[PDB]
Symmetry: T
Subunit: 149 residues, 12 copies
């Protein structure tokens, strides 16, 4: 699918509903709603739209990836903690043959606790953006626009 | 419980809803419905019935194992990604005292990425079948029939 | 929040709904309902009340932690299997700035299988109690009572 | 080769000559001769025949694998202790281009000592069946029948 | 022995004689004397008494455990550094067949340096309390009273 | 410095002089000169300029980071093989107090050989972009513009 | 069986046929026939006899262990290199229910190359003697004589 | 020194004072006094004498090794828990140039918990006897008598 | 011995009998007989002869090494799978004091599966040639010629 | 405290009483009395004194650290074997807030056995000197003199 | 390119300029000029020439590999210490599509320190010769002649 | 060479040119020129002179080490980041047969990031001084003056 004909799915994992409410030195002072606004703008800038979602449930994320697989032009995903633990989410993305996927982390996980350094999602994501703040979501959109082109 | 008196629960974990839609060289071109049909036949051949279910949700699979513990003669389980990650499903199966459990993987996980080599479920499953394709499910049923009688 | 003004949230993870039904040499013969009753009395003995919940779903536990963050005076959590696998629950507890958290394991996980020895939750929990049976929940409540005053 | 034209090679590694004489809780009370008779019946149930062999010598098993490579329709192998140590048997099976191979362990090796968890043979065996008792051999023959036709 | 007929041995390992003199954000500002008074009070509240001792010598602590084995109703031990290094103290506790043992750490060691995460003592201690401050000694006493009655 | 007052230093490590000449499926068919041209355009589109350089020599890269520290508004760096090996470049970037740094990899290093998964540079770079092709350089320029401007 | 009624089997693994021909500072100057003579002497001192064998073939050692199981009052084994590699010999000793087994190493393997530090045979051998020179075989014989009476 | 002119020092590490009082299936029913008596007679059987000591204190054991270095013809040492932890006792034995040293474990430490499998003392001890019960002390005396005569 | 007075022993490990019959991209399409013929001419070109042998049996290879130790001027060995598993063959080659030993692998084992990267034989072989095709045997012969001259 | 007002404590761990009686190539021919004299001299050159002590007992060393914390101007310590094993001594030193501490090893521990490479003391010691011979203690005195002024 | 039309590049890494000046029992007494003469002779015997170079600088070796890629018929490389550390040289070699590469080490790195056992270079070199002294360069030349033909 | 006859080479690795410009709490406020001046006076205090140099290039440091080998009486080296990565600098120092070498780190590397704990240079450096600040250079010079003496 192209940007013109289907939205980009923007998926957000656990706890990100609280973005902005603490640790601004690490994650900024923008809320999740502010991030959504940034993505709407960035997609529009490239002639597309987004479908922006958040969940604390691993299985829900899986279901939403199966939906993206049939209905969206690409996925930008910040899997949050499930980055480090979910093989299920990796396998869900693996079923998205041909679909552009960009993983985003607001923080630079490489500078944090050792368990945070690894991501299962990175094994499928076409591109991985870490430590660019909420601007990383914009880069995710920009990359999908380039690929679904 | 005997096969005569209660169904075999066949549980399928995340992403197996899409079986048949990709990677046929590894997983075959049969769909999950085709697998269900195979299981119905295999169980009938032995005078039993099946209760075949699939979920992308770890917690729903746990709930379902608690249901089998009370109501079913055995479990054949393809835990999918959760094989590698879910201590909660191992613990659920551990509550099934005396119930036959056979774990099944369509692919030979030992020939895949190193993180797929290990399974928590195998620590409780009475038998583990991997790399026998969808026929593995029929072996699961055949084992439970031998054990539940 | 003080004990006087808000309940203590007591969370229980997967499989603990079946407490009492097996392995009494390790977990005791009290049911989860008995445990809730113990907690109610322990909280009362210190001028408090509890909000006692159990779920097999990792996402629901996260959702509940976010509720406690805003509405409760502390958390006593037995994360069960999710102790060993859930970065998502660790992250949820980490959003609870200032809130007292005590992690409770009925069994002494240090005497069990190697994978049980480690807990993500212990990275945030203020106190960790293990192997004190269900009395551990009483210690959790007594700790929150000491800290939330 | 088909089942019609050539036997299934069934190979058994060291110590399995003493099967039935101890540890019946783990390995059953059937003797290796009883297993051979089970395999003859299982293969006949699918229009085939077997060539059933046992040796304590790694190099003899490699020799027999080379024989199967040219003269048999598939291999069912319980490599016993060599499963865990023999790169030579792995390399021998690797020479069997296109031949169906199923590895069988009577016990569920994933429940035993840590060194028993890993198998070189599993890196080539199409299918691996563990913890299904001597019925595993039946499943091995069933799989070969399905593949060799 | 019961609480009524013999004292609880409370053992404290190296450097704890200086408790209260530094790092109060981690260990609080109570002195060891203050901790002893807390233990006296807690034991009295359950009809018991304590025998409170501290040593910087691993072999003295071993001697004292042998004494408790014969003369006391239980042991509450904060082995301090020796928690991480002393198989000898673990072996001594292992000689105390039937005796209740609770291990206490004032700080939550799981949040500290990696070498502090593991304790040999926790392989024998019935219960392990970490990060509850000096109130963890009170939990120790409460647990022994529960078990020794 | 701001973008208006100083150029962005764009540094490329060993072997990137041959970009475009092989493995286009991984690295694209743009040459390093093409990438320079993209960076110059990207910077201009945010009111800045670039100082683009490539070297095969670890100590020359260190020298050039010292120069950036004093004369440039930020560093975009693709350290190539030295990402995995060079503590010296990490130390060099550490001296750049307050300067924005973005590391870029054309390929998704997390999908490649295990030694390629780790980067010393990511321990200082503010943001890390991987697998977004040459467009990742544009993202680096965009990030620096956001941080400097 | 007792010493009176059956010989002690003494088994020597690969390369021990050349004992005494090299490295005397490590292994001594006695030949394997001198070792056999020491064993004959030791057993006679205790009213027994020995059946002393050496082989370079793992499968042959397995076969001889099966013989001892049925025909000898105990096994003294120097498995040589196969100590470090042979799960098959371990499994063969494991079949020897009730039979006294002592493992002997002429050199102190714990002082040599790290791969020599571990032995699979020590997981079953009742006693293990290392670094006592050829007098270790004598200690072997003495141990069997104590146990087989 | 020879057996004729000086005693063999026999050192016993922590907790062995309690030998005989528990776990007889592992350690036997002999007391440490019984073992001292066994040693007196085994030395006399070879024209020697012994100086038999036990301590729970690592430094005392090092002090006694210094004394033996100057005053005794050999050392038989069961270091108990300190086998696994004490570099200080390894360094002490290392000062005993030319003195025969035999390490003894009553139990076969290679069949116990993993941390018990390794011994620092084995890095110097000339010989190491494990799993021969208290007879292992006799073998230690026998070896010293052979070396020091 | 010299090349003039004795043959070079050229030993080939398990499965090499089948060289030529598969995977020519890795191993070439020469048969083992063709390699033998290459060896004969390489040795003659330096005034020597060969004794060329192949076995699937570890023990036989050991026995043949003992023969070469007394009867031949050097050993060129491709231990095949046993390169990775056989301490026994290492120890056999260690008995060959002063005899030139060159290890050969047709394929570059360092580019293959991780378990293939390590060889016990290389701990004794004077020289190790890998990935030079069957020409590597020729280099082996050339090296023996150089050393035995 | 200044050098003018209190002595420097010089602590030596186990086995150093024997310094100079062996292994001169590693540790020199000076005795521990010679080392004391060198410290007296070095301290006097800087207007100070020393309190020079040696013990084989970990607990005594801890006791002496507590003494120094209150009574001395700094600590030079060669912990000997306890360097590698004693978290208790590290903890003792950690209580010496603000006190200068320099760790000395006569040998370069980095060139010795792997277990010797690591030191717990180095985690606190302000400075660590290894492989400078007995002259390392003069450097420790010189560093205390610099810091304590 | 063929040997007739272009020289073989022979590259030597750090410190090899001092070959011959020490450790002759490991590296021989030939100087690097002697090695160059051996390479000139061996190439001439096959109708070719060499371009022999040595550098202590990693980046200069990379530069020279790039030169070879365009101008030479093959590379024989002794990367010396950079074998073990340089992903940059590996990457340089990887750009040499279709070019024969042979890696040489004069000493048998597998008999040396553990860090020396691994080479990045070997992941690309076609052939790797180790432990054959300076004759290994001759094998390198002989291999390139065979492949360039 | 003696101190009287030739300068001590004092070599500084990458980034040290910026000493004094940041992180004074770890590295002090002296600049590299101030260090040089300190070394000049230290050497003069012992009748010697210094040749003080700094480079960011690994190969240049190796070249300088070869120069020292022929022309200088010793080496004091702070390899900075190359401590942790440069086998090349180790190998160069290894060529300096008989030459005294002391490694200096201004910061105590053992208290920093885990990768900084290890130094290849320390495998050859006779002495290693860490965490003594710039005074560590003076210790180096003092040690050289003692050894060249
Ligand atoms: O930095 C990221 O984007 C992460 O994906 C965020 C996760 C944390 C999710 C919650 O983020 C919040 C940040 C601030 C306030 C509330 C939630 C963490 O598990 C990953 O390791 C990195
Ligand atoms: O081979 C299996 O049965 C697995 O359990 C399947 C999982 C993947 C489930 C998704 O399977 C599909 C296969 C084809 C098409 C769609 C999904 C995988 O994570 C395990 O490692 C092995
Ligand atoms: O000991 C605990 O409380 C645990 O948190 C319990 C978990 C298991 C929960 C299920 O517990 C039951 C106990 C008795 C009967 C049924 C379930 C386990 O996964 C952790 O490793 C330790
Ligand atoms: O469970 C299996 O089939 C095994 O392949 C059996 C092997 C042991 C073979 C000997 O089996 C006997 C069973 C009963 C009685 C005697 C021998 C063991 O090494 C593997 O770990 C798993
Ligand atoms: O947190 C605990 O209770 C510990 O057991 C205390 C030990 C430290 C004993 C010294 O404690 C002091 C605390 C404050 C002031 C002085 C000493 C430490 O080694 C363990 O890792 C955890
Ligand atoms: O993907 C990247 O940008 C890297 O930084 C590139 C490096 C290789 C630089 C040379 O790349 C070329 C690509 C195409 C053609 C020639 C060189 C590789 O060492 C890193 O692992 C990832
Ligand atoms: O020390 C031993 O007895 C060994 O078992 C001997 C084996 C070596 C058998 C060959 O022994 C010889 C000794 C001297 C001369 C020839 C062979 C070795 O692989 C084990 O690690 C230790
Ligand atoms: O590459 C080599 O020469 C090996 O020594 C060959 C062995 C494989 C032997 C069988 O070789 C064949 C090759 C082609 C066709 C048949 C057998 C393998 O185990 C080693 O890892 C490396
Ligand atoms: O090199 C040192 O100073 C040590 O701290 C000394 C210890 C050994 C103490 C005994 O030193 C002696 C030297 C000569 C003679 C007797 C003892 C050792 O455990 C450390 O690894 C390094
Ligand atoms: O054995 C080889 O050729 C090496 O590549 C040599 C390197 C060292 C080259 C310096 O060699 C010299 C040998 C003698 C005299 C001077 C330098 C070493 O780092 C590798 O681990 C193995
Ligand atoms: O403590 C040291 O001397 C170090 O060798 C310095 C290196 C850092 C070199 C740059 O140091 C500067 C210090 C202050 C200001 C600028 C640079 C670091 O990589 C080592 O791990 C430890």
């Amino acid at each position: 699918r192209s940007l013109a004909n289907a939205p980009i799915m923007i998926l957000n994992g656990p706890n990100l509903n609280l973005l902005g409410q603490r640790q601004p030195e690490i994650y900024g002072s923008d809320t999740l709603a502010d991030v959504e606004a940034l993505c709407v703008k960035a997609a529009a800038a490239h002639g597309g739209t987004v479908d922006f979602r958040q969940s604390n449930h691993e299985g829900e994320l899986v279901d939403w990836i199966h939906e993206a697989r049939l209905n969206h032009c690409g996925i930008v995903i910040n899997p949050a903690a499930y980055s480090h633990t979910s093989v299920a989410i990796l396998d869900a993305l693996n079923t998205c043959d041909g679909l552009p996927v960009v993983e985003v982390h607001i923080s630079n996980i490489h500078q944090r606790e050792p368990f945070r350094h690894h991501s299962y999602v990175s094994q499928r994501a076409d591109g991985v953006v870490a430590g660019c703040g909420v601007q990383g979501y914009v880069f995710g959109v920009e990359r999908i626009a380039a690929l679904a082109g």
